[PDB]
Design an enzyme around this catalytic site. Structure first.
Site, PDB file in Angstrom:
ATOM      1  N   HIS A   1     -16.841 -30.960  14.188  1.00 56.98           N
ATOM      2  CA  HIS A   1     -16.911 -29.563  13.797  1.00 56.98           C
ATOM      3  C   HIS A   1     -18.298 -29.264  13.242  1.00 56.98           C
ATOM      4  CE1 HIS A   1     -12.396 -29.335  13.844  1.00 56.98           C
ATOM      5  NE2 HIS A   1     -12.688 -28.102  14.220  1.00 56.98           N
TER       6      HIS A   1
ATOM      7  N   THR B   1      -8.994 -28.863  11.495  1.00 57.89           N
ATOM      8  CA  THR B   1      -8.019 -29.395  12.430  1.00 57.89           C
ATOM      9  C   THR B   1      -8.521 -30.712  13.010  1.00 57.89           C
ATOM     10  OG1 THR B   1      -8.929 -28.270  14.378  1.00 57.89           O
ATOM     11  CG2 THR B   1      -7.360 -27.021  13.011  1.00 57.89           C
ATOM     12  N   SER B   2      -7.587 -31.612  13.304  1.00 62.76           N
ATOM     13  CA  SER B   2      -7.941 -32.802  14.062  1.00 62.76           C
ATOM     14  C   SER B   2      -8.419 -32.386  15.451  1.00 62.76           C
ATOM     15  CB  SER B   2      -6.745 -33.741  14.144  1.00 62.76           C
ATOM     16  OG  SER B   2      -6.939 -34.748  15.110  1.00 62.76           O
TER      17      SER B   2
ATOM     18  N   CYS C   1     -19.285 -26.583  16.837  1.00 61.12           N
ATOM     19  CA  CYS C   1     -19.446 -25.146  16.735  1.00 61.12           C
ATOM     20  C   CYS C   1     -20.757 -24.821  16.033  1.00 61.12           C
ATOM     21  CB  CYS C   1     -18.254 -24.526  16.000  1.00 61.12           C
ATOM     22  SG  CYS C   1     -16.693 -24.643  16.960  1.00 61.12           S
TER      23      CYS C   1
END
EC number: 3.4.22.56
Lengths: 140, 5, 92, 91, 140, 5
Positions: free
Chosen positions: E87, E28-29, E129
């Site tokens: 990310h 996802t952006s 994450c």
């Protein structure tokens, strides 16, 4: 709000797990000098006023049962909790005398949601053990 | 002697 | 008014992720003997992270391996402080 | 000689194994709190003590809000990883 | 002791801000990451760091950037700051097109591979994450 | 809205 409260009636437990002698079927060698560590630690934390419990040559099962039992103790009148692990290791892993046990498993007994008498109180895990097999060659 | 853990 | 279940843990590791940790056969491990020396000298003055930083420097500057095996000779060690603590820690 | 991995510090937004949370309007919980704590205390506190206030701010002041109940009312604690050998003052 | 921070320059502060990922990745952006990069940029300017924002870098552009920075002459800088906003998974940061091992990035600055930063603080700030677990919390 | 990285 900036310093942990350390004026509870007791500083807390200091559990020392000193593994020296490993089952020969593990291929792991004896950890010469670890008894000098476990004794140094006992005197150190006695001066800091922790109730120190030394435990020697524990299997993976005994390490898990011990940690589970301690985490179900009532720490309500204790300020903190210290756990010293002296043993062979690999990344994320500490060895009992008979085989490996994950660190995430030991420390999870003391999670905020599982050891409620230690919620909001410092939980120290001091880990003397290998984390891999790289060697630091240094730089001058 | 220095050994490894 | 919740706190995360992983908060208020400190993991004082004797060595960096991926690395060997060193022990001396007579004196004990480099990390623990440095930890006890620093706690004896500073637990009555310094915050605990600052004490552990002085353990970091002591292991890093005053210990170097001696081995008859050239593979294991002249190696160094840095410990690894891992704090999910939310507050300062004074032992006094 | 010194170790070649000495004098690093790794300030992780979250604990090993966990999601890290970001807000589409304000930014990530971690970076908001890092910048706020640096603005307020870089003139007063050693760096690790700053990052410990970051730990408290993210831990106590943020919960997730999600229309997906699986993702709702979750918490976050950052994770300071220090191989530093001395104290770090920006003043 | 405390680090010598009175070199002529405080040092560099590289911000890698990855918002948009190739559909190759399924990522996802990352809305809101621009507010972070601008916030970081203003903060380290007030600490007297030479800031360099870089946006949407591929896994390869990140590596090449890091050797080039680690090949710079830091002899007159006090420190080095690197902020990664992306990310990730445990041990891993994502470029726009795929994953990078974090330790590949940080090895360029090992005290032996980057002599002009030896003995000097190297700060890596990672917003990313580290897995897919969720902290449910506990009420104090 | 709150999202994961």
């Amino acid at each position: 709000d900036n310093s942990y409260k350390m004026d509870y009636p007791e500083m807390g437990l200091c559990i020392i797990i000193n593994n020296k002698n490993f089952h020969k079927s593990t291929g792991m060698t004896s950890r010469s000098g670890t008894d000098v560590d476990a004794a140094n630690l006992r005197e150190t934390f006695r001066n800091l006023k922790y109730e120190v419990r030394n435990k020697n040559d524990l299997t993976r099962e005994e390490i898990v049962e011990l940690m589970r039992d301690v985490s179900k103790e009532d720490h309500s009148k204790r300020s903190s909790f210290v756990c010293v692990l002296l043993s062979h290791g690999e990344e994320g892993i500490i060895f009992g005398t008979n085989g490996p046990v994950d660190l995430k498993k030991i420390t999870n007994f003391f999670r905020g949601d599982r050891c409620r008498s230690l919620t909001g109180k410092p939980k120290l895990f001091i880990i003397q053990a290998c984390r891999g097999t790289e060697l630091d060659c240094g730089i001058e | 002697v220095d050994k490894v853990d | 008014h919740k706190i995360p279940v992983e908060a208020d843990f400190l993991y004082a590791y004797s060595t960096a992720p991926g690395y060997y940790s060193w022990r001396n056969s007579k004196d004990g491990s480099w990390f623990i003997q440095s930890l006890c020396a620093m706690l004896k000298q500073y637990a009555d003055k310094l915050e605990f992270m600052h004490i552990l930083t002085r353990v970091n420097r002591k292991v890093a500057t005053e210990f170097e391996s001696f081995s008859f095996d050239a593979t294991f000779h002249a190696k160094k060690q840095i410990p690894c402080i891992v704090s999910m603590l939310t507050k300062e820690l004074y032992f006094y």
